[PDB]
Amino acid sequence: YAMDYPWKASLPRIETRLYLDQYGGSGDVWIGKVLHRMTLFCNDLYLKAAKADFSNFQKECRVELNGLRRWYLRSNLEKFGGTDPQTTLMTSYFLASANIFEANRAAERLGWARVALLADAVSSHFRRIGGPKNSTSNLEELISLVPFDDAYSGS
Amino acid sequence: YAMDYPWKASLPRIETRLYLDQYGGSGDVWIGKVLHRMTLFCNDLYLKAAKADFSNFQKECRVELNGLRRWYLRSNLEKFGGTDPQTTLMTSYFLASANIFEANRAAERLGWARVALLADAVSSHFRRIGGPKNSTSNLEELISLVPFDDAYSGS
What we know:
2 chains; mainly alpha; elongated; Syn-copalyl diphosphate synthase, chloroplastic (chains A, B)
């Protein structure tokens, strides 16, 4: 792993997930003059805590992904987006749920997902019709599909 | 004045302006056993303070009107709309300036003025074209002429 993905393309949560199968817990032993095991940072309590936290994160992510899928369908955007839109939704949500992974920061993650999907749809439409000076339809009002707020949807 | 203007149509600032020449000060006497002038509410500082404050109001109103006129000209609104711009502007600003007079609240006064002017122009255009069924243009974007802000431009 440490040789395949350098610092340039190493998402935090994917590395944390891949690490949870490589920690010895308490079955480690360090070679010295006599085999001795250090019992301060090698135990199963760390493993239990990490696994519980990751399970909670995964459940919350599943729920928010379901909600985002419902919104994506209801807002009538599937008419663009290549041949299959579900893979695009999944990719553009996972590329955000792996960086901003805290619990009290749902707004930033969901906004990242929504704006990514909108930008991709609009870019695909421009690439299909044949450039930016042949669009007779209206596009500037398309940003009104994000849910409304006071300090978010005004700027 | 107090007879030809009921409570339902009595602007505060107009009443103050018409009452600023009906309060003598020291040139008054109150009937008793002997003609005696009361001093606590009949003074001369009252007139000076009132005149200074009212002249400050005059100057602030002049400056704000001279700015709003430039805004109404540069925004290209006389093309479609009222039959005479100056009277409509003067009236629609005098209303706000005669209702909200305090000096640390120019924002609400200017906002009232701008929104009233925009609404009047749009209503005149709708009435001229023959109802809202034949209005080909797009009118939601016409609210972008109001200067942008961070928290006062979504609602």
